[PDB]
Amino acid sequence: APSRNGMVLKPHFHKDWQRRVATWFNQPARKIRRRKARQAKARRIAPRPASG
Amino acid sequence: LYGTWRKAASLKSNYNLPMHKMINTDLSRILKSPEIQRALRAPRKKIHRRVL
């Protein structure tokens, strides 16, 4: 298989990785969960600071 | 929000307006100027096609 001058590449793809892949398309949604989680934390409290 | 070349952009981080490739860019006014057309060779307009 190897050929003219190139680096020895050992990737870890013998293990059947396609079953176990977390995909980040839920990344904008959680970010809007979490502003609206902190802001839900903002208007519960009272005068006391968030990250208080 | 973008600033001149002389000052900065006083609403962003470190973004001056990006410096230029040409300054004065009138191609015709450059090429008809006295500096160039003193310095040129001569024009050459005869055709001189295939002589039988």
């Binding site: 298989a1 190897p2 050929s3 003219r4 001058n5 020895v8 050992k10 | -």
Partner: protein, 147 residues
Amino acid sequence: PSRLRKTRKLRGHVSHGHGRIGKHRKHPGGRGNAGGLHHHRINFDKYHPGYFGKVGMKHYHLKRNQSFCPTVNLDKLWTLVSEQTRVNAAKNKTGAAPIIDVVRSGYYKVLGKGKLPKQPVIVKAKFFSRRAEEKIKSVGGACVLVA
């Protein structure tokens, strides 16, 4: 872009750019790094010399954490401070000197090059190198360790 490819050019041709005679099959010389010592030594040696064997002592639980010292040379030495100070160290005053601290900028060991600024200085560091320490003694400067 599947519209800029080599595949989209090679349709209409039979073997698709892999030879009638040799017949691109699956994995002819094995998979990956197969037979490094046996039948690919003219590749492994002459292109990756030294790939096989051992050299040194083992070190267990190697942390990148007790060997941390970012260097600096005496070219960049003035570049930690605003160069306001090197003007006001050149302002004919006396042996008054800026106390340049390389520990603030993150640099622990001061290595050396040649050609350091003539004006006197005080460097505060964790580690020095004796060529660089010969250079700071050249300009009449000082050499202070921080611990």
